[PDB]
Amino acid sequence: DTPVEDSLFQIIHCFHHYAAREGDKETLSLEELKALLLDSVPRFMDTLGRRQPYYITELFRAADKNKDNQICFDEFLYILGKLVKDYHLQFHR
Amino acid sequence: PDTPVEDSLFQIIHCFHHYAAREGDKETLSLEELKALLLDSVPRFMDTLGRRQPYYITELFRAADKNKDNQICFDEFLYILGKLVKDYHLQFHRQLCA
Ligand SMILES: [Ca+2]
Ligand SMILES: [Ca+2]
Ligand SMILES: [Ca+2]
Ligand SMILES: [Ca+2]
Ligand code: NA
Ligand code: NA
């Protein structure tokens, strides 16, 4: 695999690792998303301070397009887009 | 150090920037830059059926180029990254099944 292929599989592995903990094994609850972010993107999460929990709930509701209170793989793309853009702003600054 | 996922995000960003720097705007992809990015970076994706054919790469570029300026900026590239991650998600499932 190329380094980018290794990167895509790492992201997919990540999603499944957290989604499998509770409820539907293919979807993230808010708590599964919270664990995924705190463990996987700490540089980003560390920057948010007091309003971290407010940010995670806003991100989750924005991603949960069908309002069923869980993130499927397709809805997770929304979160990946936000993470990629945040790390992009870091890649520069 | 950075987590595996953080390393993954930086790899994706680095890849975009490497190809976008070749010609024209150094922060956007020409069709020729996108084509090289895909064939070099995601060969398993490009191996699928007809994705190596001009038709597929030209239609993916057209779909991604939302403002019709004949280049893919970083925000438009997220469209392509979503398509790639969804295809590699099927490959992840086929590998688990084998
Ligand atoms: Ca779950
Ligand atoms: Ca949902
Ligand atoms: Ca360019
Ligand atoms: Ca464009
Ligand atoms: Na899956
Ligand atoms: Na950039």
The torsion angles phi and psi of A47, rounded to 5 degrees, stand at -80, -20
Name A28's bridge partners: A71
B7 appears as a binding residue in the annotation? no
Other beta carbons within 10 angstroms of residue B49's beta carbon come to 7
- Class of domain B4-96 (CATH, top level): mainly alpha
CA-closest candidate to residue A7, choices B27, B44, B97, B4: B4
* Ligand of minimum distance to the alpha carbon of A13: 5
Quick one: tokens of A54?
A: 């407010």
DSSP annotation of A24 reads S
Residue contact B42–A2, C-beta within 8 A: yes
Burial class for A58, CB neighbours closer than 10 Å (0-12, 13-18, 19+)? exposed
Rounded to 10 deg, the angle between the B4-20 and A73-92 helix axes is 70
Mutate which of A43, A71, A88, A93 to test chain B, going by most B C-beta atoms within 10 A? A88
Residue A24 φ/ψ, nearest 5 degrees? -55, 130
In the reported structure, the alpha carbon of residue B89 is separated from the centroid of ligand 5 by a whole-number distance in angstroms of: 6
- Please give the structure tokens belonging to residue A26: 């293919």
**Rounded to an integer, what is the distance from CA A53 to the centroid of its chain?**
14
Instruction: Show the tokens assigned to B50.
Output: 């007809």
Burial of residue B36, with CB atoms counted within 10 A of its CB: 0-12 exposed, 13-18 middle, 19 or more buried? middle
Alpha-carbon torsion, ordered A40, A45, A51, A57, to 10 deg: -30
B95: exposed, middle or buried (Cβ count in 10 Å: 0-12, 13-18, 19+): exposed
Nearest to A42 by CA among B2, B8, B7, B10: B2
Name the residue among A12, A39, A84 with its Cβ closest to that of B9. A84
DSSP B25-55: STTSB-HHHHHHHHHHH-HHHHHSTTTTSHH
- DSSP type of residue A49: G
Secondary structure of residue B7 in the 3-state scheme: helix
Distance CA B30, CA B24 (A): 8
Question: How far is A82 from A88, CA to CA, in rounded Å?
Answer: 10
Nearest to A4 among B4, B12, B17 (CB): B12
Cα–Cα separations (whole angstroms), residue B74 to A58, A83, B13, B24, B48? 23, 13, 9, 15, 25
Q: Quick one: how far is CA A7 from the chain centroid?
A: 15
* Per-position DSSP letters for B63-93, written without gaps between them: HH-TT-SSSB-HHHHHHHHHHHHHHHHHHHH
Residue in chain A closest to B79 (alpha carbons) equals A81
Q: Which residue from B69, B81, B64 is spatially nearest to B13, judged by alpha carbons?
A: B81
Size of interface A-B (CB pairs under 8 A): 91
CATH code reported for the domain at A3-92: 1.10.238.10
The residues near A56 (Cβ < 8 Å, ≥ 6 apart) are: A30, A33, A34, A37
